Amino acid sequence: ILGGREAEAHARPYMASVQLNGAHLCGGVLVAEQWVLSAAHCLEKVQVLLGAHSLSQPEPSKRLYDVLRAVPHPDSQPDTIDHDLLLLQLSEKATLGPAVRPLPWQRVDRDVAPGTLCDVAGWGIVNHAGRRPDSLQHVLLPVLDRATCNRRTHHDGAITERLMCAESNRRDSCKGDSGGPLVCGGVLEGVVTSGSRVCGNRKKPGIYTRVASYAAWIDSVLASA
Ligand SMILES: NC(=O)n1cc(NC(=O)N2C[C@H](F)C[C@H]2C(=O)Nc2cccc(OC(F)(F)F)c2)c2ccccc21
Numbered sequence: 001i002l003g004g005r006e007a008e009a010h011a012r013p014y015m016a017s018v019q020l021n022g023a024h025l026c027g028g029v030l031v032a033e034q035w036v037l038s039a040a041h042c043l044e045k046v047q048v049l050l051g052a053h054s055l056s057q058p059e060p061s062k063r064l065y066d067v068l069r070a071v072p073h074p075d076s077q078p079d080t081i082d083h084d085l086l087l088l089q090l091s092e093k094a095t096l097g098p099a100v101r102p103l104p105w106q107r108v109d110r111d112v113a114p115g116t117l118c119d120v121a122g123w124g125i126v127n128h129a130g131r132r133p134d135s136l137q138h139v140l141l142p143v144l145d146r147a148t149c150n151r152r153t154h155h156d157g158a159i160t161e162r163l164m165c166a167e168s169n170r171r172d173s174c175k176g177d178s179g180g181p182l183v184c185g186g187v188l189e190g191v192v193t194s195g196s197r198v199c200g201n202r203k204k205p206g207i208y209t210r211v212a213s214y215a216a217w218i219d220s221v222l223a224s225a
Contacts, residue, residue: 003171004139009053014103017049027180038179039194040076061099066091081195105188114145118184124176141166162213165205174199
């Protein structure tokens with residue numbers, strides 16, 4: 001997260017860190033008792049850290065789960081950010097409590113109002129040098145209408161109806177925030193894309209996958225256990 005602030009500890013109990021060999025790689029979002037949603041290129045030794053604020057310090061709520069199965073969206077492709085979703089089935093159902101709870105996710109396939117203030121959280125890089133934070137960061141970002149996001153000087157027609165944008169003027173998602181939650185009105189709306197992109201430039205808005213657009217996919221995979 002560029003231009004953000006340290007989040008309140010445990011105030012986002014749905015927040016996951018998706019890890020490879022005990023190192024943070026992507027954000028994730030607990031969406032069912034045994035399932036974490038993240039982004040497709042995150043998988044390209046997989047564990048999921050729940051109940052955390054600090055990646056390194058002991059916390060009573062923190063628990064690192066093994067992953068039984070990793071299910072990247074079957075239409076996802078290395079060179080694109082289309083269909084950029086990943087579901088991770090934990091080795092067991094997560095132990096729930098005030099610091100570990102799933103997030104309700106949007107099933108109405110219609111756009112949020114332009115300007116809606118959404119929260120994005122993560123352990124991604126925090127400056128141009130690539131500094132990695134030990135504790136969870138967040139930022140409040142206004143949603144940016146699709147027509148502007150698609151203008152020639154911005155993302156030039158790459159924004160489908162299955163993607164949404166937020167403003168990226170100094171406050172932004174960046175590397176390592178991939179897979180994490182864009183939350184609007186207490187509901188999961190988007191997931192941070194995992195394609196490389198310039199961070200913090202107003203002319204290059206943040207891109208997030210619209211979970212409502214993938215409701216059939218998520219329902220099926222969540223039911224496949
Ligand atoms: N949406 C958004 O703006 N971006 C998303 C990016 N992609 C990303 O993040 N990925 C790709 C994989 F899914 C693995 C993952 C990754 O690199 N993870 C990674 C690798 C090394 C360290 C790390 O931890 C760190 F703390 F640094 F973030 C994460 C990205 C890269 C550069 C700039 C913008 C970026």
